[PDB]
C-alpha cells in the first residue's frame, strides 16, 4: 500500500523546462516501473513515460524529444523534466505505477501562461427591470482581469448561500481569466436588505466588498 | 497507437437503471486487455474491470465487463447515487498505454425552463475601457441551450462567450451565462442589446433586450 | 482615445528585479511609442524609457544598464524590468503615450525596503493637564511599527467626523513606519462619551478598538 | 540632460490673483518645445502649455505661457479653487525627457496661532522599552514652524522627526506634530522636557514644557 | 548599532535548495564576520558558517558540504544557500556577527515538507456524561488535518476567552498538522449559551464555525 | 566539535530564590572562553557572561558566573520575574562553535491535581476512516504526566501523541491532551477504551474508561 506524494512548480512561463517529482512510501520501491500520466481538458489521460530503478526508461513517441525522467534510489524518488513547455501542457499530471492499475498519486495541477500576478477588478452587475420578474431577482458582481487561478466569492460574509452561482473562470484572449457569481433574491429582499459580495485573491491580497445598486 | 472512442460523453440516466458504455477500439486489443476505469471529481481514476471481463478486488458486483475484438461493453446494472463520473477505457496491450475519451453519467430530471435575464455594463466598467454585457440562464436540466446575442439587430459570431456550472447537488440542474466582451467605442456606437435563447423546454424561443441610457 | 490599466508586484525587497506592466485599449497600439514615466518623493519626474511594436527602445542614460523593456503586440501589452533594485526605487510608475502629451496610466505605488510585514502597535494619547486648556482638549493614539504603507484610522466607528487629524505616515531610521491620529474635543466631554480610534491594517489582517484613557 | 529648475514652490496667492511661475532652463530650448503640467493629488499631471505659448485644447484660456530661448515663464490670470495643485515644466527638444522640480500654489489667508498641545509618553510604551514624546501644534496656517526639543536645558538635534498636515478644505489651515523618540536610560535621567515653538504668527516666541515625577 | 533584517522562503519542499539575505544597516559592513545560526527543535543552537566582506568563507564540518555562503559588497548584503533540504531542516535560521555577542537577526521560520496545502476540517466533540462531573465538563472541536502551520481556534468570536486553553500543532505523518483546543465552562452556561468552534485558516480561506452540544 | 552538555533539565525554584546552572564540557576549554546566553520566548539570544566570569555591559549585578577547567556554574542571585526563560552557554576556544542542549527555568508554586476528562470518537469521523480517542488532563503543576492506554484491558504503546501547552500565566500550571489514532475494524470490534495516567498529585493513580455503544 504505497503513498505516492507529488509536488513541483505551478505556475510556469512559456519555453520554461517542467519538473515534477514524485515520492514513493509502503512498501518495496526496486523491481517496478513508476509512470507519469497527464490529463488535460479537452483531450483525455495520456500516458508520458516509465522509469525503474535502473535507470531504463520508456517513452511515448509523441513526447519523445521532451521527456526526460530520473531515478533517486537513494531516496525513493523518481522525477519528470518535460523541455519546452507551451500553452497546452497545461494539464493535471499524476504519479502511478507501471500501468496505473493500482495505486496512483494525487495530481498536480501545472499551468504554463505568460503573465504577472494581478488583483481583480469586481464590477456591479445591476438587477434591471426585466431582472424584476415579480418574485425573482438576479443579481452579482462580475470579477474580471485577474491572473492567478483560485478566487473565491460569497455573498454577506456567508450569510446568503442559497441561489449562488459561481461560475467557472474562463480565459480571455489577455492571459487573465474572469469570473462571474450570481444569486436570485425576492424584490421585497432587495428593497429591505443589503447584499455585498466578498470576492477575495490571495496572489494579490486584495479583498473587495463590492455593493450592488439596484 | 489505438485510438479508442467511446459513446457520447453526455449519456443521462435516472438513478436505477442499467448503463452501456462502449469503447470501439481502433485495432483488434491482443488478449483482450482493456480496462475500464473511473474517476470521480477532484480524485484520481480507479480501476473496475480488467481483462474486459473480470472486476477488480474490492469492486461491487454491479460494474459487469464484457466484448471482444475491437466492440467492449460496460455495464452497470444499478445506478447508485455514488456512481454518477467519468469512466475511461485503457488498453494495455500495446506499448503505448492508450486511454479512451471517456463518458460521463449524470442524473436525469424532468425538463425546465431557463430563467432569462441581462444585465447593462457598469458605469466603472465602462470607463475602464471595455464594456461586458452578460445574459444568464438559471435552473434548466437539459445541458444543451444555444445563446445568439443580437446587437443593432444583427447576429454576433465569436465575439462572445460563455461557461456553465456543474450539475446541482440538489435539485440536478445546470446554469449558463453568456457574455458579450465589446469595446466601448463599439458599444456606444449601437442602440440595442439582446441575446436569443433556444431550449426544448420553451417551444417559442424567448428574447431579451435593453436599451442603452435609460434603466 | 486610450485607457491604460496598469499592473505590477508592488511590494519588493532589495536586489529582486522590478516587473511593471500596462495595457492599452481603445485605439490601435501599433504606430506609437509607449512611455514608462517615475515620480519619486523629494525628487521630480523622470522619464525611464519607450518602446514600440517593434521592439526599438530609447533608455535614459540614467537609469541605462537596469531598465529593459518588452513588448507583447498580440495582447497589446508593453511591460518593464528594472534589475537589481534598490531602495531609491520607492516612487509611482506611470505608462503614458509618446511624451505624454495625451494620456496618462493612473499609477503603482512600488515600495522597496528590507522589513518583514508587521501589525500596528497603538498606544493611548492621554490628554495631560496642559494641553487641557479648559475648554479645549486633544485625544488620539499613536500607531508604530508597521510595515506595509497603507492604515486607515476611525473613530466610533465613523461617529466623529469633526476634528480628526490624520498626520501622514513617517519612516524612522528602522525600516518600520509610525503615524499619528488626533481629534479636538471638550474637556467635559472627556466624562460623557467614550472615544474610541478603530484602527485597522488590510496587509496584516488586524482591527483594534483600543480605548484612550485619561 | 538639460537640468531644468523653477521658482520657490511655496508661493502662496490669494484666491482670484494672478500667479506667475518660471521654468529656468539650463540652456537653450530647441523650437521653443516647452510644455506645462498641472498635477492635482492623487492624479497623474495633464497639459496646460504646449509650445511655450498655446494652450491645449480642452483647457481654459486662464492659462497663459510665455518666454522663450532658456527662460521661460507660466502666467494664470484667475486662481480658481480647482487651480492649487504642482505645476511641473517639460522640455521636449533634446533626447532625454526631463522634468522640472514643480512649485506648488495653495490658498492664502490670514495668519492664525498654532494651538499647542503636549503629551507624555504612556506606561506600556515606556515596559516596551521606548519612550516618545510628542507635542502638537493645531491651526496654524504658515507653513514654517521651528519646533525644537529642549531637555534640560540642553541643545537636542536630529533626534526627533515631524509631521506636516496637508490643506485644509474648510478654512485652509495645518497641524505640525512632532515626536521626541528616546532610550529608557535617557528618558529615566533626564528631568524636563520641551519644544520650542517659534512662529511668525506671534511676535514673541512661546514654550510649553512638563517634568517627569509630577502629574 | 547595526540593524540586522533578514528575508528568505518561509516554505521549501524536499531535493530544493533553500535561500536567506540578511542586511546589514548602520555601521560599517567590511572588516568583520558574519554568521548564519540555526536553531532546530530538540536540538540546541548551531553554528552554520561565516563569511566578510572579501569572501573567505568559514564553515561547520557537518554543514560542510551543503552550505554556500555569498556576499555583495555593494548593498551591505550576505546569503546563505543550503543544498538539498530534507525535512531535518526545519529550524529558525538567525544573522549575527562572527559570535553573535553584540547583534542578532530577527528569526526567519523555515519549514522542509512534500505536502500542498489542505483546508482544515473540524470534528464536534461532544462532552460525555462521564465528562460531565455535574458541573465540570470540556467541549471543543478537533481540526485533522492541515497543512501550514498558521491556524486559530476562537469561542464565540472572542465573546468567550476565559478557561480556553489552545493545544500546539501536531505534525502527524501524512504531513499535516493537528490541533486541538478546548473550554471549561459550567453545565448550566453550557445548556444556557450555546459555544461555537471559529476557525479561520488563512492560506485556505476557509471560516467553519461548528456547535457541538450534549 | 566539544559536545557540550548541561545537567539540570528543566529547572523549576519559586521566584526570589537562588539559581545555579551547570554547563559540563566535553573538553577543556582553551581560556574559560565560554559564555551564557539567554533567550526570552519569541526573541533571539542575548549574553549575560563573558568569559564565564564577567559580565556583559548593560547586565544587571544579579548574575554572576564562575568555574574552570571543565566546570562552569552560572548563579542568577535573585529571580527576577523577568528572568524565567532558556538559557544556552557557548564555547569559543575550538574552531566550530558550539552551544549547550538548553535549559529552562519556570515559576514554582504548590503540586496541583490532573481533571481527567474522556471523550469518544466522533460519528463523522468514525465515518471519515479516522477512530481518534482523546483523553485531557487540566491544570496540573509538575510537568511529568504519563498516558498509558488500554485497549480491550490489553496494552498497547506507540500509537498515540502527546501535545503539552505552555504554562499559564494566571494559575502557573498545565493541560496535557493525548491523541490515540486506531483503525476501522480494530475500533469496531474493540469494546474498552481508557488511558492510564500516574502522577504524584494523587498517591492512587485514578482510570475513567467509557465504553462503545452507549452514553
Known amino acids: 500500500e504505497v503513498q505516492l506524494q507529488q509536488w513541483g512548480a505551478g505556475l510556469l512561463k512559456p519555453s520554461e523546462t517542467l519538473s515534477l517529482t514524485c515520492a514513493v512510501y509502503?512498501?518495496?520501491?526496486?523491481?517496478?516501473?513508476w509512470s507519469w500520466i497527464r490529463q488535460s481538458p479537452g483531450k483525455g489521460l495520456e500516458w508520458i513515460g516509465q522509469?525503474?530503478?535502473?535507470?531504463?526508461?520508456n517513452y511515448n513517441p509523441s513526447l519523445k524529444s521532451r521527456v526526460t525522467m530520473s531515478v533517486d534510489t537513494s531516496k525513493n524518488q523518481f522525477s519528470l523534466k518535460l523541455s519546452s513547455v507551451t500553452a497546452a501542457d497545461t494539464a493535471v499530471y499524476y504519479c502511478?505505477?507501471?500501468?496505473?492499475?493500482?495505486?496512483w498519486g494525487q495530481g498536480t495541477l501545472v499551468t504554463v501562461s505568460s503573465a504577472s500576478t494581478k488583483g481583480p477588478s469586481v464590477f456591479p452587475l445591476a438587477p434591471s427591470s426585466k431582472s424584476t420578474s415579480g418574485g425573482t431577482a438576479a443579481l452579482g458582481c462580475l470579477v474580471k482581469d485577474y491572473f492567478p487561478e483560485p478566487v473565491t466569492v460569497s455573498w454577506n460574509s456567508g450569510a446568503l448561500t442559497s441561489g449562488v452561482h459561481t461560475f467557472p473562470a474562463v480565459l480571455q484572449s489577455s492571459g487573465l481569466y474572469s469570473l462571474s457569481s450570481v444569486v436570485t433574491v425576492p424584490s421585497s429582499s432587495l428593497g429591505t436588505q443589503t447584499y455585498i459580495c466578498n470576492v477575495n485573491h490571495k496572489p494579490s491580497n486584495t479583498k473587495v466588498d463590492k455593493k450592488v445598486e439596484p | 497507437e489505438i485510438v479508442m472512442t467511446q459513446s457520447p460523453g453526455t449519456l443521462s440516466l435516472s438513478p436505477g437503471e442499467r448503463a452501456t458504455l462502449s469503447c470501439r477500439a481502433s485495432?483488434?486489443?491482443?488478449?483482450?486487455?482493456l480496462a475500464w476505469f473511473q474517476q470521480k471529481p477532484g480524485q484520481a481514476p480507479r480501476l473496475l474491470i480488467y481483462?474486459?471481463?473480470s472486476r477488480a478486488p474490492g469492486i461491487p458486483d454491479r460494474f459487469s465487463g464484457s466484448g471482444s475484438g475491437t466492440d467492449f461493453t460496460l455495464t452497470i446494472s444499478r445506478l447508485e447515487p455514488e456512481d454518477f463520473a467519468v469512466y475511461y477505457c485503457?488498453?494495455?496491450?500495446?506499448?503505448?498505454?492508450?486511454f479512451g475519451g471517456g463518458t460521463k453519467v449524470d442524473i436525469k430530471r424532468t425538463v425546465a425552463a431557463p430563467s432569462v435575464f441581462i444585465f447593462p455594463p457598469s458605469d466603472e466598467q465602462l470607463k475602464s475601457g471595455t464594456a461586458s454585457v452578460v445574459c444568464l440562464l438559471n435552473n434548466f436540466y437539459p445541458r444543451e441551450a444555444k445563446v445568439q446575442w443580437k446587437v443593432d439587430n444583427a447576429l454576433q459570431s465569436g465575439n462572445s462567450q460563455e461557461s456553465v456550472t456543474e450539475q446541482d447537488s440538489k435539485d440536478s440542474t445546470y446554469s449558463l451565462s453568456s457574455t458579450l466582451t465589446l469595446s466601448k467605442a463599439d458599444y456606444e456606437k449601437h442602440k440595442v442589446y439582446a441575446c436569443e435563447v433556444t431550449h426544448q423546454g420553451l417551444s417559442s424561443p424567448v428574447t431579451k433586450s435593453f436599451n442603452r441610457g435609460e434603466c | 482615445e486610450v485607457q491604460l490599466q496598469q499592473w505590477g508586484a508592488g511590494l519588493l525587497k532589495p536586489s529582486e528585479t522590478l516587473s511593471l506592466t500596462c495595457?492599452?485599449?481603445?485605439?490601435?497600439?501599433?504606430?506609437?511609442?509607449?512611455?514608462?514615466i517615475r515620480q519619486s518623493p523629494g525628487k521630480g519626474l523622470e522619464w525611464?524609457?519607450?518602446?514600440?511594436?517593434?521592439?526599438?527602445?530609447?533608455?535614459?542614460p540614467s537609469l541605462k544598464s537596469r531598465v529593459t523593456m518588452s513588448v507583447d503586440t498580440s495582447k497589446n501589452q508593453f511591460s518593464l524590468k528594472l534589475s537589481s533594485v534598490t531602495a531609491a526605487d520607492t516612487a509611482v510608475?506611470?505608462?503614458?503615450?509618446?511624451?505624454?502629451?495625451?494620456?496618462?496610466?493612473?499609477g503603482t505605488l512600488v515600495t522597496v525596503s528590507s522589513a518583514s510585514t508587521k501589525g500596528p502597535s497603538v498606544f493611548p494619547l492621554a490628554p495631560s493637564s496642559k494641553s487641557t486648556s479648559g475648554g479645549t482638549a486633544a485625544l488620539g493614539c499613536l500607531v508604530k511599527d508597521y510595515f506595509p504603507e497603507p492604515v486607515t484610522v476611525s473613530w466610533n466607528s465613523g461617529a466623529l467626523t469633526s476634528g480628526v487629524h490624520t498626520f501622514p505616515a513617517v519612516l524612522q531610521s528602522s525600516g518600520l513606519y509610525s503615524l499619528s491620529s488626533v481629534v479636538t474635543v471638550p474637556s467635559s466631554s472627556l466624562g460623557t462619551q467614550t472615544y474610541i480610534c478603530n484602527v485597522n491594517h488590510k496587509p496584516s489582517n488586524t482591527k483594534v478598538d483600543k480605548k484612550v484613557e485619561p | 540632460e538639460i537640468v531644468m529648475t523653477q521658482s520657490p514652490g511655496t508661493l502662496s496667492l490669494s484666491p482670484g490673483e494672478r500667479a506667475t511661475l518660471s521654468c529656468?532652463?539650463?540652456?537653450?530650448?530647441?523650437?521653443?518645445?516647452?510644455?506645462?503640467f498641472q498635477q492635482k493629488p492623487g492624479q497623474a499631471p495633464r497639459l496646460?502649455?504646449?509650445?511655450?505659448?498655446?494652450?491645449?485644447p480642452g483647457i481654459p484660456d486662464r492659462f497663459s505661457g510665455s518666454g522663450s530661448g532658456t527662460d521661460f515663464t507660466l502666467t494664470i490670470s484667475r486662481l480658481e479653487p480647482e487651480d492649487f495643485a504642482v505645476?511641473?515644466?517639460?522640455?521636449?527638444?533634446?533626447?532625454?525627457?526631463?522634468?522640472?522640480?514643480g512649485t506648488k500654489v495653495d490658498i492664502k489667508r490670514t495668519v492664525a496661532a498654532p494651538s499647542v498641545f503636549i503629551f507624555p509618553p504612556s506606561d506600556e510604551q515606556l515596559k516596551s522599552g521606548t519612550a516618545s514624546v510628542v507635542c502638537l501644534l493645531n491651526n496654524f496656517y504658515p507653513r514654517e514652524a521651528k519646533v525644537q526639543w529642549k531637555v534640560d536645558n540642553a541643545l537636542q538635534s536630529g533626534n526627533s522627526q515631524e509631521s506636516v498636515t496637508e490643506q485644509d478644505s474648510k478654512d485652509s489651515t495645518y497641524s505640525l506634530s512632532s515626536t521626541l523618540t528616546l532610550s529608557k536610560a535617557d528618558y529615566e535621567k533626564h528631568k524636563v522636557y520641551a519644544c520650542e515653538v517659534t512662529h511668525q504668527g506671534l511676535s514673541s516666541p512661546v514654550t510649553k514644557s512638563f517634568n517627569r515625577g509630577e502629574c | 548599532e547595526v540593524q540586522l533584517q533578514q528575508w528568505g522562503a518561509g516554505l521549501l519542499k524536499p531535493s530544493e535548495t533553500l535561500s536567506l539575505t540578511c542586511?546589514?544597516?548602520?555601521?560599517?559592513?567590511?572588516?568583520?564576520?558574519?554568521?548564519?545560526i540555526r536553531q532546530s527543535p530538540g536540538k540546541g543552537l548551531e553554528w552554520?558558517?561565516?563569511?566578510?566582506?572579501?569572501?573567505?568563507?568559514?564553515?561547520?564540518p557537518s554543514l560542510k558540504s551543503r552550505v554556500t555562503m555569498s556576499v555583495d559588497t555593494s548593498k551591505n548584503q550576505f546569503s546563505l544557500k543550503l543544498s538539498s533540504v530534507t525535512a531535518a531542516d526545519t529550524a529558525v535560521?538567525?544573522?549575527?556577527?562572527?559570535?553573535?555577542?553584540?547583534?542578532?537577526?530577527?528569526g526567519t521560520l523555515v519549514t522542509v515538507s512534500s505536502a500542498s496545502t489542505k483546508g482544515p476540517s473540524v470534528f464536534p466533540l461532544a462532552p460525555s456524561s462521564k465528562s460531565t462531573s455535574g458541573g465540570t465538563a470540556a467541549l471543543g472541536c478537533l481540526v485533522k488535518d492541515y497543512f501550514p502551520e498558521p491556524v486559530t481556534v476562537s469561542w464565540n468570536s472572542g465573546a468567550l476567552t476565559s478557561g480556553v486553553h489552545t493545544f500546539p500543532a501536531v505534525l502527524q505523518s501524512s504531513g499535516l498538522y493537528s490541533l486541538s483546543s478546548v473550554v471549561t465552562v459550567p453545565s448550566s452556561s453550557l445548556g444556557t449559551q450555546t459555544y461555537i468552534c471559529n476557525v479561520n485558516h488563512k492560506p485556505s480561506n476557509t471560516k467553519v464555525d461548528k456547535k457541538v452540544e450534549p | 566539535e566539544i559536545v557540550m552538555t548541561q545537567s539540570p533539565g528543566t529547572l523549576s525554584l519559586s521566584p526570589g530564590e537562588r539559581a545555579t546552572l551547570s554547563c559540563?564540557?566535553?573538553?577543556?576549554?582553551?581560556?574559560?572562553?565560554?559564555?551564557?546566553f539567554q533567550q526570552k520566548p519569541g526573541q533571539a539570544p542575548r549574553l549575560?557572561?563573558?568569559?564565564?566570569?564577567?559580565?556583559?555591559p548593560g547586565i544587571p549585578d544579579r548574575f554572576s558566573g564562575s568555574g574552570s577547567g571543565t566546570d562552569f556554574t552560572l548563579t542568577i542571585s535573585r529571580l527576577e520575574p523577568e528572568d524565567f526563560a532558556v538559557?544556552?552557554?557557548?564555547?569559543?576556544?575550538?574552531?566550530?562553535?558550539?552551544?549547550?542542549?538548553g535549559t529552562k527555568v519556570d515559576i514554582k508554586r504548590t503540586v496541583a491535581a490532573p481533571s481527567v476528562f474522556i471523550f469518544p470518537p466522533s460519528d463523522e469521523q468514525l465515518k471519515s476512516g479516522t477512530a481518534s480517542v482523546v483523553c485531557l488532563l487540566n491544570n496540573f503543576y509538575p510537568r511529568e504526566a504519563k498516558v498509558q492506554w488500554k485497549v480491550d484491558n490489553a496494552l498497547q504503546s506507540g500509537n498515540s501523541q502527546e501535545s503539552v501547552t505552555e504554562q499559564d500565566s494566571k494559575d502557573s500550571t498545565y493541560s496535557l491532551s493525548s491523541t490515540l489514532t486506531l483503525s476501522k475494524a480494530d475500533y469496531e470490534k474493540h469494546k474498552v477504551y481508557a488511558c492510564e495516567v500516574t502522577h504524584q498529585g494523587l498517591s492512587s493513580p485514578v482510570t475513567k474508561s467509557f465504553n462503545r455503544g452507549e452514553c
Open positions: 502511478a505505477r507501471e500501468l496505473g492499475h493500482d495505486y
Open positions: 509502503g512498501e518495496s520501491f526496486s523491481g517496478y516501473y
Open positions: 522509469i525503474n530503478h535502473s535507470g531504463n526508461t
Open positions: 485495432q483488434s486489443i491482443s488478449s483482450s486487455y
Open positions: 481483462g474486459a471481463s
Open positions: 485503457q488498453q494495455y496491450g500495446d506499448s503505448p498505454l492508450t
